[PDB]
Design a protein around this ligand. Structure first.
Ligand SMILES: Nc1ncnc2c1ncn2[C@@H]1O[C@H](CO)[C@@H](O)[C@H]1O
Ligand SMILES: Nc1ncnc2c1ncn2[C@@H]1O[C@H](CO)[C@@H](O)[C@H]1O
Ligand SMILES: c1ccc2c(c1)[nH]c1cnccc12
Ligand SMILES: c1ccc2c(c1)[nH]c1cnccc12
Ligand SMILES: [K+]
Ligand SMILES: [K+]
Lengths: 330, 330
């Protein structure tokens, strides 16, 4: 018996969420459905144009860790906040979900990362992220005991933007594999993949990553192709297990020559897609660390994702474990 | 043509919102449905026991001003935040709604007020408020030109808790009545009324307040009676106009011997009662300053209240003006 099912590592972010029209994205040159990196000046600018907002703890890997705990798994998280009110919110929210979170802030400046997330009428989300204190995440923040005692260590593609986070990730990979654990990543965003395409391929091909998460857009970007079938064939060749999501078209889990397709749950209405991919990973990884079939992992992932997209905010406010029990996924 | 329809004055607060069971309230000695003042030590203690939360700009009068702007009226707000991240959120949200808000922070400590609001399964909300920078609001924060140029100046009973806010209110009353405007207050909370019963009665009887807002519990507390008919008779004798809310039983507007009963709107589900009274005031006062009948003012209030209780958070995220037009209140 270990200490953790899943350790996640990512950019520790508080979300600032508002509804907007499609014209707002165009007028502000915000790339729809993407993670748009912004500096401090642009952050003030966009905020000044944003309507009344709601704040909620975010960060892709943070959301995933929270989702694992919610389901009943044992989660830990590495991510750097500042010693400020946003950092205190982030710290409270993830710990309150029962995620082990011990990353120490290094002062108040730069301040805690925030992402201004604009949700259009179709429920799509477009994020505008000032990384702030995230740029300080480094090897010093790896709790080696936690990596050793975690069945899976999962991290964001997004970690390739700050300068030193990749160094922590390579340390994690070493420790995890020396202790017989597995490493997992998400490709995070199609433009993120475009920035670090060769780096991500090498992580998979070198065996530093055992399990990869992608959506259709990320898979297409990875191989710079318009052929989804090609992308699936190539991603299966590059990593031991790939979990590929296709929004309303469900998901497909790849392992060698095996493909396992899973239906998407039918939705009342899509309120806010923020966190869908993150909570797919929560469901998948919770299932995987419980020894479940790859199809059942995919099912648990789709259930979590379906729930999160029917609420405002990236972390389900309801019990995922109760939802899983009702679904016979238990 | 004057600059503002409604000026409101209150405690400038950011809400920290979480769902709990009724046992949580009992275990923590939290008075259900009430505003519970807390010190910094208790605030840290309650937060440590609170689940994952979402944050949203609050403050009773702040919500009311936001509501008036949403409906399409011209609003201003007086309230003191700190120069910190929470005060920046508060400043942004209220201004983003189109409310004039120019109260200057005086420093970073005490920090911006926050209220931990626990929503039980029945949708009732129980608030736990550390006043922080609110204690600094005083005469120096009265923008005399704004008072002079506002049709109605409305304020919270809650302002009697901090030490100097009442002095600002007395100055407001003087400037308002010198310029032929009207003053309004809400009784805020039944325990607030119990703390300041004689002071509140004197505000009404002296004519410093022209229009009073109360719910049933507040009206009963004011006269220390179990007889609601007595409370209505007495409140009508003590102020020019009283607007008394009765939750699912609608509202009654009183003027001398005139009484106007208004029905509650039909609702899907009570998600979170936070802000109901605030937004009743928004609807009523928007109507009042547009020269609408007292019955139509009550209708506009019940519409606004009904909308806010079907969402999480105290400020409607949808267009109240659109809703009013759809309801045939225009
Ligand atoms: N650069 C980034 N790194 C990690 N997560 C991010 C980034 N930008 C936005 N997010 C998070 O993505 C989550 C949705 O997947 C949001 O909660 C938001 O907090
Ligand atoms: N002491 C207080 N004074 C003014 N407003 C308050 C107080 N405590 C809580 N509130 C606000 O009451 C609003 C709901 O009516 C909430 O948004 C909360 O912010
Ligand atoms: C960002 C997002 C997607 C893409 C990209 C950059 N470059 C590509 C080249 N080919 C296909 C997709 C992409
Ligand atoms: C708080 C809330 C309600 C009340 C109170 C204090 N004192 C009362 C005396 N009589 C009736 C109600 C009350
Ligand atoms: K969501
Ligand atoms: K509400």
């Amino acid at each position: 018996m270990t200490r953790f099912d899943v350790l996640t590592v990512g950019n520790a972010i508080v979300d600032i969420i508002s509804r907007c029209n499609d014209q707002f994205l165009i007028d502000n040159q915000i790339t729809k459905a993407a993670m748009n990196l912004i500096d401090a000046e642009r952050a003030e600018l966009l905020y000044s144009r944003m309507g009344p907002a709601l704040e909620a703890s975010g960060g892709s890997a943070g959301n995933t860790a929270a989702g694992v705990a919610n389901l009943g798994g044992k989660a830990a998280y590495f991510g750097n906040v500042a010693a400020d009110q946003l950092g205190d919110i982030f710290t409270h929210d993830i710990r309150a979900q029962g995620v082990h979170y011990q990353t120490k802030p290094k002062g108040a400046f730069p301040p805690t990362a925030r992402s201004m997330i604009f949700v259009t009428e179709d429920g799509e989300r477009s994020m505008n992220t000032y990384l702030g204190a995230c740029v300080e995440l480094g090897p010093e923040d790896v709790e080696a005991d936690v990596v050793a005692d975690a069945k899976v260590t999962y991290f964001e593609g997004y970690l390739w933007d700050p300068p030193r986070a990749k160094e922590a990730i390579l340390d994690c990979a070493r420790i995890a594999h020396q202790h017989g654990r597995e490493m997992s990543m998400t490709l995070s965003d199609s433009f993120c993949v475009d920035r670090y395409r060769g780096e991500f391929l090498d992580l998979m091909r070198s065996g530093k990553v055992d399990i990869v998460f992608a959506n259709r857009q990320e898979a297409l970007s990875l191989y710079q192709t318009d052929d989804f079938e090609e992308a699936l064939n190539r991603i299966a060749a590059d990593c031991k297990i790939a979990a590929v999501t296709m929004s309303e078209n469900g998901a497909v889990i790849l392992k060698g020559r095996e493909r396992y397709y899973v239906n998407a749950i039918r939705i009342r209405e899509v309120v806010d897609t923020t966190g869908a991919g993150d909570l797919f990973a929560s469901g998948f990884l919770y299932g995987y660390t419980q020894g479940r079939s790859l199809e059942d992992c995919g099912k648990l992932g789709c259930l979590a994702a379906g729930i999160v997209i029917q609420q405002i905010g990236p972390r389900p406010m309801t019990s995922l474990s109760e939802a899983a029990k009702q679904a016979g996924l238990i």
